Design a protein around this ligand. Sequence first.
Ligand code: HEM
Ligand SMILES: N[C@@H](Cc1c[nH]c2c(Cl)cccc12)C(=O)O
Length: 349
Amino acid sequence: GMISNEISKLDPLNLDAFFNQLPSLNQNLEVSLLIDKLREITKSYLPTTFSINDALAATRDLGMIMSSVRKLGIQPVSAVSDLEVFLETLSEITNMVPRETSYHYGPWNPIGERERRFTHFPDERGLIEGVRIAIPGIELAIREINQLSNLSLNDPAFESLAKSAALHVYQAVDGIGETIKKTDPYVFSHELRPFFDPIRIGGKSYIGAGGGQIPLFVVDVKLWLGNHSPNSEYVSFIKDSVFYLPPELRPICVDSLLEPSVINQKFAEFGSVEITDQVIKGMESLLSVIQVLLKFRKPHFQLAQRTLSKENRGNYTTGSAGYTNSFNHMVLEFTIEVEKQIRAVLAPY
Ligand code: HEM
Ligand SMILES: N[C@@H](Cc1c[nH]c2c(Cl)cccc12)C(=O)O
């Protein structure tokens, strides 16, 4: 478990003053100052001496300087070739990618004066608050949904855990609503999106931080996807994402991809045991969770559609992971289909 407060409060590379300048440096395209800071960092710090929390915060801070350079069109590790050993040492300690993710940008990013930010645009706050709210709640919902596999539908503990998970997933809904109300789609495409492009590090390419990196897909795999669609595009996105996750989430995701999902296994229990009143309540509680997922994916799809429109898309047709809104349409159709299947099983009652 990575406690966010213990990471957000760190400044292991003494960059707090620099991050008050960074929005202005990025505005004036001052690539010399960005590159000079990367060079100073590799000479000023023995990263092998860092604790885990220090290395996570360093990844957060160094990652944002790197993404700023990449935003100008320069591969930062090709320009500062000593970065590669530095980043490699850091990722040995974190056992995470040598690059920042949504985790670094949201929950590990401090609130207030020290908040790390690429730009001066307040639309940026919409992305930061979006993932900073979404991630902790989704993580609690993962712990709770994981316990459902080992409870009976007829146990009120089942229904109560699923309800808790639905409440915690609502944090993803609150997160995307913060984005819808603060982030203008046109300012996103033209001012924010360019900071989330891929960076070549040790001969492979790491996508930038993205909303898709909140572990919502982990909820999906345990809850409905399981091992049921082996060749889908969504299982390929998840495949590519497992090792971007914090280590503690990786076994949950891997085992869930290799097992039947909760809803599939609870469908079997339902149509084979004595269907009582607690059992309907328990099955009703799984549909509640799914319906919360839709309360996220429906407005998310609209937001992505206004942003990728001809008028609004700027220079991009994809998200940071290389997909169009078609991918969102497919994840959301998958979820609508589970809601239909659950409502079918319940219709007699
Ligand atoms: C202007 C704002 C946004 C746009 C244009 C946008 C668009 C997209 C796009 C194009 C994808 C496809 C995957 C990829 O290529 O990376 C995607 C995936 C995803 N994004 Fe966003 N997004 C926005 C804001 C957010 C926010 C704030 C969050 C979370 C708080 C979020 C969460 C997700 C998730 C969870 C996925 C994976 C698909 C799913 O589970 O439905 N997005 N988004
Ligand atoms: N969710 C979209 C747009 C996006 C890029 N970076 C983000 C961040 Cl860092 C937070 C929230 C959303 C986004 C994507 O995954 O590329």
